[PDB]
Every structure is written in C-alpha cells, then in structure tokens.
Design an enzyme around this catalytic site. Sequence first.
Site, mmCIF file in Angstrom:
data_model
loop_
_atom_site.group_PDB
_atom_site.id
_atom_site.type_symbol
_atom_site.label_atom_id
_atom_site.label_comp_id
_atom_site.label_asym_id
_atom_site.label_seq_id
_atom_site.Cartn_x
_atom_site.Cartn_y
_atom_site.Cartn_z
ATOM 1 N N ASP A 145 0.794 -1.338 0.057
ATOM 2 C CA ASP A 145 0.060 0.002 -0.131
ATOM 3 C C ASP A 145 0.949 1.414 -0.202
ATOM 4 O O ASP A 145 0.629 2.490 -0.774
ATOM 5 C CB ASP A 145 -0.988 0.004 1.288
ATOM 6 C CG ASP A 145 -1.908 -1.105 1.346
ATOM 7 O OD1 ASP A 145 -2.496 -1.085 0.316
ATOM 8 O OD2 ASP A 145 -1.509 -1.899 2.407
ATOM 9 N N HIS B 205 -5.069 -3.100 5.773
ATOM 10 C CA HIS B 205 -4.583 -3.336 4.622
ATOM 11 C C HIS B 205 -6.185 -3.690 3.889
ATOM 12 O O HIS B 205 -6.518 -4.892 3.679
ATOM 13 C CB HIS B 205 -3.657 -4.714 4.383
ATOM 14 C CG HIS B 205 -3.440 -4.903 2.896
ATOM 15 N ND1 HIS B 205 -2.685 -4.060 2.184
ATOM 16 C CD2 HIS B 205 -3.812 -5.976 2.108
ATOM 17 C CE1 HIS B 205 -2.597 -4.759 0.955
ATOM 18 N NE2 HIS B 205 -3.356 -5.939 0.863
HETATM 19 N N1 LIG Z 1 -0.246 -6.623 0.250
HETATM 20 C C1 LIG Z 1 -0.691 -7.824 0.754
HETATM 21 O O1 LIG Z 1 -0.734 -7.873 1.852
HETATM 22 C C2 LIG Z 1 -1.036 -8.827 -0.240
HETATM 23 C C3 LIG Z 1 -0.889 -8.494 -1.588
HETATM 24 C C4 LIG Z 1 -1.344 -9.490 -2.696
HETATM 25 C C5 LIG Z 1 -1.803 -10.535 -1.963
HETATM 26 N N2 LIG Z 1 -1.890 -10.879 -0.744
HETATM 27 C C6 LIG Z 1 -2.520 -12.253 -0.249
HETATM 28 O O2 LIG Z 1 -1.454 -13.120 -0.207
HETATM 29 C C7 LIG Z 1 -1.814 -14.677 -0.548
HETATM 30 C C8 LIG Z 1 -1.318 -15.262 -1.492
HETATM 31 O O3 LIG Z 1 -1.527 -14.801 -2.866
HETATM 32 P P1 LIG Z 1 -1.095 -15.596 -3.919
HETATM 33 O O4 LIG Z 1 -1.491 -14.705 -5.129
HETATM 34 O O5 LIG Z 1 0.489 -16.049 -3.654
HETATM 35 O O6 LIG Z 1 -2.342 -16.889 -3.779
HETATM 36 P P2 LIG Z 1 -1.762 -18.272 -4.265
HETATM 37 O O7 LIG Z 1 -3.099 -19.017 -4.057
HETATM 38 O O8 LIG Z 1 -0.980 -18.299 -5.592
HETATM 39 O O9 LIG Z 1 -0.795 -18.967 -3.169
HETATM 40 C C9 LIG Z 1 -1.095 -19.351 -1.834
HETATM 41 C C10 LIG Z 1 -0.439 -20.502 -1.272
HETATM 42 O O10 LIG Z 1 -0.753 -20.538 0.006
HETATM 43 C C11 LIG Z 1 -0.978 -22.228 0.113
HETATM 44 N N3 LIG Z 1 -1.454 -22.618 1.399
HETATM 45 C C12 LIG Z 1 -2.753 -22.678 1.499
HETATM 46 N N4 LIG Z 1 -2.910 -23.074 2.725
HETATM 47 C C13 LIG Z 1 -1.714 -23.117 3.386
HETATM 48 C C14 LIG Z 1 -1.251 -23.470 4.758
HETATM 49 N N5 LIG Z 1 -1.798 -23.966 5.792
HETATM 50 N N6 LIG Z 1 0.096 -23.694 4.929
HETATM 51 C C15 LIG Z 1 0.966 -23.100 3.937
HETATM 52 N N7 LIG Z 1 0.605 -22.888 2.646
HETATM 53 C C16 LIG Z 1 -0.627 -22.746 2.392
HETATM 54 C C17 LIG Z 1 -1.448 -22.689 -1.024
HETATM 55 O O11 LIG Z 1 -1.479 -23.926 -1.360
HETATM 56 C C18 LIG Z 1 -1.059 -21.863 -2.321
HETATM 57 O O12 LIG Z 1 0.127 -22.420 -2.887
HETATM 58 C C19 LIG Z 1 -3.423 -14.382 -0.574
HETATM 59 O O13 LIG Z 1 -4.124 -14.313 0.976
HETATM 60 C C20 LIG Z 1 -3.600 -12.899 -1.126
HETATM 61 O O14 LIG Z 1 -4.831 -12.384 -0.760
HETATM 62 C C21 LIG Z 1 -1.629 -9.762 0.057
#
Ligand SMILES: NC(=O)c1ccc[n+]([C@@H]2O[C@H](COP(=O)([O-])OP(=O)(O)OC[C@H]3O[C@@H](n4cnc5c(N)ncnc54)[C@H](O)[C@@H]3O)[C@@H](O)[C@H]2O)c1
Lengths: 331, 331
Positions: free
Chosen positions: B159, B187
């Site tokens: 952000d 966030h």
């Molecule tokens: N600025 C921010 O804070 C920000 C920015 C973008 C995305 N996000 C968030 O980050 C997260 C990941 O986004 P992404 O695009 O990499 O998603 P993604 O689905 O590609 O990756 C998430 C991974 O987490 C894994 N996972 C699920 N449960 C789990 C557990 N218990 N232990 C370990 N791994 C587990 C899944 O198998 C998957 O490989 C999402 O929650 C998304 O909304 C946050």
Amino acid sequence: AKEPVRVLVTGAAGQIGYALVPMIARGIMLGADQPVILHMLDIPPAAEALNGVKMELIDAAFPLLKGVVATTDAVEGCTGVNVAVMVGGFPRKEGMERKDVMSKNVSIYKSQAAALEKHAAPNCKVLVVANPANTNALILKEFAPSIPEKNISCLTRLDHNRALGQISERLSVPVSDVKNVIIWGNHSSSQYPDVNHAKVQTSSGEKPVRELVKDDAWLDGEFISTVQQRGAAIIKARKLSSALSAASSACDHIRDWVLGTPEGTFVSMGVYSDGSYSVPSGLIYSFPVTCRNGDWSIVQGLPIDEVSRKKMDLTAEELKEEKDLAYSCLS
Amino acid sequence: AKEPVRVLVTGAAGQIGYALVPMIARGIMLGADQPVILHMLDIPPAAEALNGVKMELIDAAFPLLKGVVATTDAVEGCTGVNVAVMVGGFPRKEGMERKDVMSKNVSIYKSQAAALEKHAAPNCKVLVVANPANTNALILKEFAPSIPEKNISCLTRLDHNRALGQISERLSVPVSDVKNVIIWGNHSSSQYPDVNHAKVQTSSGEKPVRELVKDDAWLDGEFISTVQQRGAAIIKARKLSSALSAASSACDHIRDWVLGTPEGTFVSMGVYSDGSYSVPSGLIYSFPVTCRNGDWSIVQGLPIDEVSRKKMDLTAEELKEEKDLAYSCLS
Ligand SMILES: NC(=O)c1ccc[n+]([C@@H]2O[C@H](COP(=O)([O-])OP(=O)(O)OC[C@H]3O[C@@H](n4cnc5c(N)ncnc54)[C@H](O)[C@@H]3O)[C@@H](O)[C@H]2O)c1
Ligand SMILES: NC(=O)c1ccc[n+]([C@@H]2O[C@H](COP(=O)([O-])OP(=O)(O)OC[C@H]3O[C@@H](n4cnc5c(N)ncnc54)[C@H](O)[C@@H]3O)[C@@H](O)[C@H]2O)c1
Ligand code: NA
Ligand code: NA
Ligand code: NA
Ligand code: NA
C-alpha cells in the site's frame, strides 16, 4: 551511475517476463548503483496483462527504476535500448510438432531483427532466451547484419547453473564453492555439460570436481543426462517450464557480460562461433568465456579429449539440423 | 555475514511465493553479504509444485543460498527460523463470501501460531502477507502469546509503495525522489493513505507533496480511492492479484526492519498497537515507523487534523469488525 540503461524485455507478459522484470528493476542485472529504464514488449492479446505488469512495477516503488514503456509496438519497444533480453515466443505444448514450435518462434526473430537493427542503440547487447534459443539467435543475427556479431548471444547460463547445482548437491557443498563447469553447444538435450575443467573450494584448497566426486561413471553418464533433461524435469514437477531460474540466469548472463567475470572464473554463453575449438563457424554455440570491457572472449587453450570432441561435434550437428529446419520454415 | 539467516516462506508454491523466494536468495531481503537458508512451506496438494520450486532454486546457483527445505510439515518448516514471511492462504475468488475467505484463512494462522511459537528461533521476526493481513496477524499473535508482541507484523508496505508510485506518476518524477507517505490502519479499502507528511526532492530542496501537486481535491479524493482500490485494479488487468509487487514490498518490509530505515525516512508497517495516536490498543494496525537495531518504533509527534483523525478511527472500526468475524469463525 547517473545515466540510465535502457533494457528491453520481449515476452514481458509471460512467465519468465514476470520473474525477470523485477530483478532488473532491483539492480540484479546491471548492479545496485545503475538506474534502469524498462521497455516491455508483448503481443496484442496480452495488452491488458502487460499494462498489469507495468502497474505492479510502479507499485513496487523501485528506486533504480526511471521509466517503464509497456507496449505491443516492436519499433517503440526497441527504440534506444542498450540491452535486449528476448523472451518472446511460444513454449512447446503437448500436441505440437518440432516443425511448428520452430516455425512459430523463428518467425518472431526474423521480424524483430529489423526493429532492433533499425532502432536499438548502436552497441546494444542482445540475449535470446526464447526456445530454440541458439537457433532463434542465429536467425536474429542473420536478419540483423548491421548488429556486431559479438553482440548477439543466447542463454545457456541456466544449463551452466544447473550443472553447478548438480555438483553442489552431489557433494553437499554450497554452490558458491563450485565453478568452471562448461556447457558446450546447443541449449537442448544434446548439450555437453563438461566438468573436466571445474573446481570446488575445499578446506585444503581448490580441487577438481572429478577428484572430489570419485565417480566418473556418474559424471559421464547420469550427471550429463540429468542436466540434459532438467528442463523436462521442471515441467514434470510444475506443469510449466522454468521461469524463476531462467530469469535469474538471464540476469547472471547479462551481468557477467557487462560488469565482467571474476578473476579465475569462466561462464557459458551461446555466441557466434569463430572456428574456436574446431566448432563450425557461423553457428550460435555455447562456449566457455570470460568477460571484460563489455565483451566476451572464448577461453582458449583448454585441453579437449576424444569423448569431449565427439560430444562437441554431435551438438554442432544438431545445431545445423535446427538451422535447416528454421530455414525451411522461413522460405 | 559468516552465519546464515533462516527464512521461512509459507504459501511457497503459490504466486507470491514464486516471486519472493528468488528475491530472498539473491540478497534483496537481508543484504548482499548475508547468506540465507530458505524454508518453504505449502500444503500436500502442492507437494510436487513445491519440489519444483526447490529444483529451480538449486538450478539458479544462488551464491548466498546455503540450503532449501521444501515441505508440507509445519513443524519442520518453522524449526530454527529467524524470519517468517507468511503467505499461505486462499485469495478471494468470485463466488466466495467474506465469511468464507475469513474462515479459510484465519484457521491457518490459528494453527501455525503453535508451530512457530514452539519451533521458530526466539527473536524470530514475523511478517503476515496473506489476506486479510492485519487480522491473520492478530490471530497469529493471539495464538502465540510467547512471541514478543513487537515481533509480529503484517504487510502494508505494498500500500505504501503504491502511494509513493501514485505521487511519482502524478508529478512525473522518479519514485526515488518521493518519501514519507503513511498508510494508516487496515490493508483494505478502508486504509488512509496520508500525504500530509510526505516530501519530494526537487532542484530547490525537499518540498511537501501538497505544495508540488497543488490539487488537494485529487489528494483527498481520487488519490485515496486509487490506492484503496489498487489491488482490485491489478486483478482487473491481470486476472490475478499482485505478486511481483507484493513480494518486492515484503522484501522492503523485512529489509527495513532488520537493517534499519535511512535517516530522514519512515515507512508503514502493520504492528501491534500500543495506544499511540489514540488508536485502540491490541489491534494489528499500520503506523508510520522507523527501524533501528531490528526493532520498529512508531513515529510519534506527527500532527493529526480532524479529517485524518476520522479516517484513522474508521479503519480501526473495520479492523474490530474483522476481528469479530474471525472470532466467529474460530469458535
Ligand atoms: N499486500 C498484501 O498484503 C497482499 C498482496 C497480494 C496478495 N496478498 C495475499 O497473499 C496471499 C497469497 O496470494 P497468492 O497470489 O500467492 O495466492 P496463491 O493461491 O497463488 O498462493 C497461496 C499458497 O498458499 C498455500 N497454502 C494454503 N494453505 C496453506 C497452509 N496451511 N500452509 C501453507 N501454505 C498454504 C496454497 O497451497 C498456495 O500454494 C493471499 O491471501 C492474497 O490475498 C496480500
Ligand atoms: N534457458 C532457456 O533458454 C530457457 C528456459 C526456459 C524457457 N525458455 C523459453 O523461454 C520462452 C518463454 O517461456 P515462458 O514460460 O515465459 O512462456 P510464456 O508463454 O509464459 O511467455 C512468452 C510470452 O511471449 C509472448 N510473445 C509471443 N510472441 C511474441 C512477439 N512477437 N513479441 C513479443 N512477445 C511475444 C507471449 O504473448 C507470451 O506473453 C519459451 O520459448 C521457453 O521455451 C528458455
Ligand atoms: Na566414465
Ligand atoms: Na576467439
Ligand atoms: Na480537499
Ligand atoms: Na509507541
């Protein structure tokens, strides 16, 4: 460090592109004190995704990044560029024949050679990543005869780094202690990953890889097969070809080329053959090189045994076969 | 620089994970002279993909990288770690309700708090990226009462960087010249991107952002909406939420925390509120901070006007609402 370097990445909306552009923006390709301008080129169906990438690059607030051009216009993408990393292409999918993969990719390089030749900055350094890497680069070189022949290269640095990683894992030593493997020839399963001149730092000095491994059968058989098949192994594990490691290795290739190789180290680069090591001249072929003043130089004077010779010639022959197929597609 | 830092990335087989791990391996997170060991944790359905990532990390021959553990066992993943970047989760897909997104993600943090508390190294620094970031972090903190409260954070650095990028683009200056925006609160679309204390380097010195922009209506309206909605904008452009920029911003968060913020700069971090700025205590809430000796410190003494106050309280209230929903899911 005041003036920026303009770096083009083609195929920028794809998998490698997405891994690569933030590495460039962070200074991994040209050094922590070198500002960069990115030009990102892709094709009209990826226009939205490409703009998405630019939005992310802006959103990262990269202090070295002084501009981002994100476009589908090859003229615009190539204008004024000092480094061109060519990732634009179509990876082989199940159901495609070797002729179709070749035809869809070499046409790109025929076309974009003119745009680069006419618009890139004069001493622009070119690295072709898209497969088939050596043959795409050779086509680019042939269609851009005004680009100095030493300024066109293709990526065998991932093969090289893979080889280093295999040695590191086999010996259970840190990869930072391993150097001077050589990848000869084609970025393909015909490559020769050569450890005859490689070293490992130990507590009692630099030792040759063969002395530490003590398993010539492994080095001459399964080690070679493993490196040759490693890209297919990535696809089996991930359902996608390599990207993180291809991007990182493309950074290493450019970085070493521009900033120089360390004393005592050589690395592998696909470059325009000049007859060195009795490899046919006029191929894009991977050699061991050192870099200084922005130029590669083939490491001359390495002893070549009979088995090495035969492997070097086998891969040269595959490159000729590929060249013939590419020609066939372009006429 | 002799001893390695152990860095855990959870969600390592996902999109952000794939962008993030090679940045860590290159030294972007903890510095060019700091070796690292990676621990990568994901879940059993991604076991093959995860091994694929490890294969690529080996294949890149990263000299700072001294080991990679790639696992689905949370105990193993958390053992001995010094930095934990928690990306494991499930991003909101069309068709999911707010309760389901919350329930699927906060359960992860309840569970993994015990593994971290019992197995991570004592002064382990924790950064929660997975959404909802602040609430996931708060749940982690509540389930790991032995972790020092100052060692748990969530990511609002994307952000923050987005805000810096918007100013850079609006003024057409390099982002390296812009600093000291503040992201207050959650966030989410309730965040307050505050430019009241931000500066831009010009040819006649550091000037406040408002003086250069001369459009308070834009800064107080569309600028704020743009930052609040930027993640949704990325999804619209790419059909996927941010990754390159989230990974890069997670590096920035950790790096600044561990190595310190530059003199004259503050950055935004979601941290455990202590009553500063009359924000309710016991929330994970984004504040302006400086970092020194591995510790954050809220920048005290900033003047807060009426409009800022109201925005700060609105976002605090959303965080309470989220907390209530998370609690509801966990009982
Ligand atoms: N600025 C921010 O804070 C920000 C920015 C973008 C995305 N996000 C968030 O980050 C997260 C990941 O986004 P992404 O695009 O990499 O998603 P993604 O689905 O590609 O990756 C998430 C991974 O987490 C894994 N996972 C699920 N449960 C789990 C557990 N218990 N232990 C370990 N791994 C587990 C899944 O198998 C998957 O490989 C999402 O929650 C998304 O909304 C946050
Ligand atoms: N070591 C290596 O040399 C190495 C390693 C891995 C992959 N590769 C090769 O790199 C290439 C890219 O792999 P990827 O996984 O990023 O594939 P990808 O399909 O995700 O990306 C390729 C991109 O190229 C774009 N493209 C197609 N035609 C174009 C044109 N005329 N101009 C610009 N862009 C164009 C596509 O739209 C796509 O966005 C493939 O050819 C692949 O086989 C090489
Ligand atoms: Na043998
Ligand atoms: Na020569
Ligand atoms: Na106003
Ligand atoms: Na305080």
